RNA sequence: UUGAGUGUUUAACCCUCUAACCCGCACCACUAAUCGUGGUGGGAGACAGUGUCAGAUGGGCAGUUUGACUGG
RNA sequence: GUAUGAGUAGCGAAAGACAGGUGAGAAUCCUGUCCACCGUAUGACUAAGGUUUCCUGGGGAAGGCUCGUCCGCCCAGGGUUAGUCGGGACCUAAGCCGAGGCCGAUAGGCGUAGGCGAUGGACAACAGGUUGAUAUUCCUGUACCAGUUGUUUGUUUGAGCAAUGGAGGGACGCAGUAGGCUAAGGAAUGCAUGCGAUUGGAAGUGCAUGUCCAAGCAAUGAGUCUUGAGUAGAGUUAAAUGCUUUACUCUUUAAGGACAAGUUGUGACGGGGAGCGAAAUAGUAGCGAAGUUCCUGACGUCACACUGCCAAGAAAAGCUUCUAGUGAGAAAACAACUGCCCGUACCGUAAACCGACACAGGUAGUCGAGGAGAGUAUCCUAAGGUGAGCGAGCGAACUCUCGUUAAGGAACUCGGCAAAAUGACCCCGUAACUUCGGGAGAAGGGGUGCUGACUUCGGUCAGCCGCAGUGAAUAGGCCCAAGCGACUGUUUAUCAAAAACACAGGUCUCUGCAAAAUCGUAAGAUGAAGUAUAGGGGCUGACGCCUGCCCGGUGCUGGA
């Protein structure tokens, strides 16, 4: 649930947080962590290519199985854990050979289930199958877009897609955001929707907590000088003395579309709905 | 090369006191070992050696006649004996 | 009241020394222009 | 660069194929390797990318111009 | 090159005085005595940095804001000692370099294998003595680590050794209290000496001084952490008796296993120790008493051990196992031998570093005592350091820094600017308003020293003295109203700290992943080891109530 703080300081008045009640341990598996660095938005060359990033808390990377390739061997669920790198929770899983792995935690996963990962698997939450073998109207997450590469699509906290129909060598899916699309019928996905979903309702509360997450502050274009922004300059507060407010590099900012007009995937997109 | 290694003895007031505990001071070559000096001394006098000690000495700024520059570098080794003696004067 | 020059031995050799001047093509332009003038010290 | 077949209309157009071209897909060898090169599948395909020419748009950026008389 | 201003400004925070030495010459150098200053530092140790400034014997032309017999200055000689400390012959982070490679008018840009690179990991010695100048380096005593020589059975493997392979391990955040030990501190038992010449004191209750010790080895140990076994199977690229794991069965205050500050012996018939003190130039050589009890007690160490939280907290080698394995026969006794290169002086809250200066500035880390105190605050002091590189007189105007002031009390000035006033602890009390937390130390008042008695305990009663009892130093003035910005934060190094910027929250829009966006000719990158509850761009700016009318014009989107 969402936890509400009492207003004991001015920096506390309207903050909320997670209860962390689906999490069952706080000590990760040692053989599945690697280091990370916090690039802070800088390049190959040492230059800022993305503004407003840098300098929070240190993190170790957990390796996830986005492929789901170990078939005809059940895996038991041992823990539901905290990941610093994503917004979903994560599950430690014991295969019977004794391989260990991490997995994205779907909605309603209990410690103790036994998941299966092939074409003859059942339709239960957690199970992963090729899209050919999934009926019409099942809620789905963690979708491959190329055979054998790993799920890419429905991965963040509380998201889901749905199966609409089949044809020759393609399956129709309605994704999160409402776009309709085609995906190869030999790709995989796992049954369920992603888990921790109150995540959306958290109120950060003060300027220090979003500094703990690795975000640096943002200055508005219109309190700059005319050599920094197209919006800078003028005596006093000023309006947008232009048509169409723009980015620091020109490029209009309300309603102007920026995807590639000769995209090699415009064959597969039915019914653009939201971007 | 065992005969270019030892250069000469040091004869100062701090080194006369060492000759009374069976210790001898020599300016040795730069690029010489503790072990190489030990071999050379055992070869050139027929003694038995316990324990060479070794130091480096920095050059000194000097200034004679509106022309200044440094003296040489130096290497000083102090050789201790078990029981025998060398007579230098 | 902290002034600009704060001495350090490693930095002076790593930014201005002989090997740093030898590793670029413009460092060797510097070394040749100093040898052509008669400098007694061509590289820090 | 760039190939092949059918059909629909007055040449153009909608298509289908697979061998070029592409792959920030998988497995294999050089091999200590998430680079690279070869090999086999899969995907995509005469499209895309790249060269020469042409029409738009373009203070994002550049070089300049913005007269004289005059009880100042 | 030389004048004028002119023998004028200044001589860079601070306590000295006298006696005697030396000498051509002394306020300024030496020796003494008393006085004064710092003491969470102006004391002790060290990493940078400097680079001979360090010690001894001479000197006085220049440097030293005066002087100089003196010196961090000048001349001559001399000083730095390591198997164990810090670095290399060990490991890796960021970043850097990169055989082949990929890109590109040239020059060149990037990057794979593999390397370099500590500010981190790993890693065997202590206590005392000694010089004019070095000491975990020399010496004394007693150790430890890695090797070498000698004297004390089928390389199949049941001897031994064993991987560039399989595994285990190393291996990690912030806050908060509690416990245990030791360092450090205080007051009285033991010592040793000696009795006041200004009124008084031979002392169970009187003055001054002192009141202990290592590494290693052996014994144990305040305590802390962790369940353990059996069978049937997966697996671990070949093999494993090693490791991971699924299912079942017994087991749980238990048993087993692991780690542990310290303490007591030995080391030690040794060392140090108040003082005593020579044969000569020596407080010198040398000779030495005593080692107690009680109170207080560390964020030092056990130890990031335990608890709680969210923002979720390096890598690699040494190390330890298991086999695969070219593969006579090496285990452990004693003895005696071997063990390389670089640094090591001295300054280091400073006259030796950064500031052109012997400059009122700046400089990482450890140690940092007593009384009264919560304290590293405050005042006075201990161990230690210092009297600060121009002086002697006088005691005018004026300028600066300080102390006091009759009567009045903001009449001053742009403005109570600047001063004065409040200030500690204990007790009583305390409004409107409010987001229910606050407002609040609201406001306003009272107590405080010393002796005796009782003290249930914490205090209360009786008495005494002064103008005054937190008798010094240190420590909120408050109240009633209105504008701006919710708030903590940030800003014009060097005339502007704010009503400006940011902010949590709102809303519009772009983006289906080789994402949009940005660096770049490209290769390659960030975004992101992310995937629409995600990432970019514009405006507004907690929270409460709300956010009207217009699509003609201009942009944007869709059309045909």
Q: Which of B76, B59, B67 is nearest to B23 (CA)?
A: B76
In angstroms, the CA of C17 and the C1' of E315 are apart by: 31
Quickly give C41 CA vs E1 C1' distance in Å. Answer: 38
Distance B49 CA to E274 C1' (A): 47
Q: Which nucleotides of E are covered by protein (CB under 7 A)?
A: 48-52, 75, 77-82, 93-96, 107-108, 110-111, 132-133, 137-139, 168-169, 171, 233-235, 244-247, 309-315, 338-344, 353-355, 361-362, 435-437, 486-488, 500-505, 508-519, 524-527, 529-543, 554-558
Is A191 in contact with A124 (CB distance < 8 Å)?
Answer: yes
Q: Using an 8 Å Cβ cutoff, are A134 and A116 in contact?
A: no
Return the SS3 of C35: helix
HEC per residue, chain B:
CCCCCEEEECCCHHHHHHCCCCEEEEEECCCCCHHHHHHHHHHHHCCCEEEEEEEEECCCEEECCCCEEECCCEEEEEEEECCCCCCCC
Q: How many CB atoms lie within 10 A of CB A183?
A: 21
Residue nearest to nucleotide E540 (CA to C1'): A220
Dist CA A140 CA A189 (whole Å):
6
Number of domains in chain B: 1
Q: How far is the CA of A42 from the C1' of E112 (A)?
A: 23
Map tokens 């909605």 to a residue: A107
Cα separation, A125 vs A113, in Å, equals 10
Protein-to-nucleotide distance from the CA of A152 to the C1' of E437, whole angstroms: 47
Q: Cβ distance A155 to A144 under 8 Å?
A: no
Nearest residue to A188 via CA among A71, A85, A64: A71
Instruction: State how far the alpha carbon of A221 is from the alpha carbons of A155, A210, A218, B64, in Å.
Output: 33, 21, 9, 70
**Could you tell me if A104 and A117 are in contact, meaning their C-beta atoms sit under 8 angstroms apart?**
no
Closest nucleotide to B34 by C1' from CA: E340
Q: Which of A122, A118, A150 is nearest to A138 (CA)?
A: A122
Q: Which residues contact A59 (CB under 8 A, 6 or more apart)?
A: A36, A38, A84, A85
Q: Name the protein residue, with chain letter, whose CA is nearest the C1' of E510.
A: A257
Instruction: Spell out the residues 6+ positions from residue A37 whose beta carbon is closer than 8 angstroms to its own.
Output: none
Residue located via tokens 């103790």 = A112
Please tell me the number of Cα atoms within 13 Å of B70 on its side-chain side. 7
Query: How far does the CA of C2 sit from the C1' of E370, in Å?
Result: 39
- Detail the protein residues whose CB sits closer than 7 A to any atom belonging to strand D: A 146-149, 169, 184, 186, 230, 249-250, 262, 264, 267
Name subunits touching C (3+ CB pairs < 8 A).
none
Tokens of A180: 């309709």
Binding-site residues of A for Mg(2+), please? 52
Known binding residues of A are 52
User: Which nucleotide has its C1' atom closest to residue A82's CA?
Assistant: E312
Residue A24 vs residues A71, A84, A106, A194: alpha-carbon distances, Å: 27, 16, 15, 18
Q: Name subunits touching B (3+ CB pairs < 8 A).
A: none
b/e map of B12-29 (b: 16 or more CB within 10 Å)? eeebeebeeebebbbbbe
CA→C1' distance for A6 and E142 (Å): 68
Domain that holds residue B2: 1-89
Interatomic CA distance for residues A127 and A190, integer angstroms:
5
DSSP secondary structure string, chain A? -EEE---SSGGGTT-EEE---S---S---GGGEE-----TTB-TTS-BSSSSB-------EEP--SS----S--EEEEEEE--SSSSS-EEEEEESSS-EEEEE-BTTPPTT-EE--STT--S-TT-EEEGGGS-TT-EEES-BSSTTT-B-SS-STT--EEEEEE-SSEEEEE-TTS-EEEEETT-EEEES-BS--GGGG----STTHHHHTTB-----GGGS-TTT-TT---SSS----SSS-EETTEEE-SS---S-TT-TTTTT-B-----
β-bridge mates for residue B84, sequence order? none
User: CB-based contacts of B85: which residues, under 8 Å, 6+ apart?
Assistant: B22, B47
What's the distance, CA B81 to chain centroid? 14
Which tokens belong to A91?
């599950």
Structural determination approach:
cryo-EM
For residue A147, give the nucleotide whose C1' atom is nearest its CA.
D25
Nucleotides of D under 7 A from a protein CB: 25-27, 41-45, 47-49, 59-60
Provide the 8-state DSSP code for C16: H
Q: For A187-222, give one letter per residue: b (16+ CB within 10 A) or e.
A: bbbbbbbbbbbebeeeeebeeeeeeeebeeeeeebb
Structure tokens at B54: 């070794």
CA neighbours closer than 13 Å in the CB half-sphere of residue A113: 16
Residue with tokens 């939201």: A274
d(CA A118, C1' E41) / Å: 77
């Amino acid at each position: 649930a969402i936890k509400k703080y009492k207003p004991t300081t001015n920096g506390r008045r309207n903050m909320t947080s997670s209860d962390f009640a689906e999490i069952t341990t706080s000590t990760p598996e040692k053989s599945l962590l690697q280091p990370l660095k916090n690039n802070a938005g800088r390049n190959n060359n040492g230059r800022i290519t993305v503004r407003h990033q840098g300098g929070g808390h240190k993190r170790q990377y957990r390796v996830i199985d986005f492929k789901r390739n170990k078939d005809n061997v059940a895996a038991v669920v041992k823990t539901i854990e905290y990941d610093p790198n994503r917004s979903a929770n994560i599950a430690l899983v014991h295969y019977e050979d004794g391989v260990k792995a991490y997995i994205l935690a779907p909605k309603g996963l209990e410690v103790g289930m036994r998941l299966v990962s092939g074409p003859e698997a059942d339709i239960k939450v957690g199970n992963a199958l090729p899209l050919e073998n999934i009926p019409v109207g099942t809620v789905i997450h963690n979708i491959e877009m190329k055979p054998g590469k790993g799920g890419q699509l429905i991965r963040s906290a509380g998201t889901s897609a749905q199966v609409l129909g089949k044809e020759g060598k393609y399956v129709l899916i309605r994704l999160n955001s409402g776009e309709v699309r085609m995906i190869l019928a030999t790709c995989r996905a796992t049954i369920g929707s992603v888990g921790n979903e109150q995540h959306e309702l958290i109120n950060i509360g003060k300027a220090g907590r979003s500094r703990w997450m690795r975000k640096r502050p943002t200055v508005r274009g219109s309190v700059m000088n005319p050599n920094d922004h197209p919006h800078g300059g003028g005596e006093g507060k000023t309006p947008i003395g232009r048509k169409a407010p723009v980015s620091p590099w020109g490029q209009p900012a309300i309603g102007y579309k920026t995807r590639n007009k000769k995209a090699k995937s415009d064959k597969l997109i039915v019914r653009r709905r939201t971007k | 090369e065992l005969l270019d290694v030892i250069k000469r003895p040091v004869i100062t007031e701090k080194s006369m006191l060492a000759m009374d505990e069976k210790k001898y001071t020599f300016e040795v070559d730069t690029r010489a070992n503790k072990t190489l000096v030990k071999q050379a001394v055992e070869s050139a006098f027929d003694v038995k050696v316990a324990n060479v000690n070794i130091l480096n000495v920095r050059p000194k700024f000097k200034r004679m006649g509106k022309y200044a520059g440094y003296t040489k570098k130096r290497r000083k080794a102090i050789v201790t004996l078990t029981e025998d003696s060398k007579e230098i004067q | 009241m902290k002034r600009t020059y704060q001495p350090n031995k490693r930095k002076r050799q790593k930014v201005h020394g002989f090997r740093k001047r030898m590793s670029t093509k413009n460092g060797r332009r510097v070394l040749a222009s100093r040898r052509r003038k008669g400098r007694k010290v061509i590289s820090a």
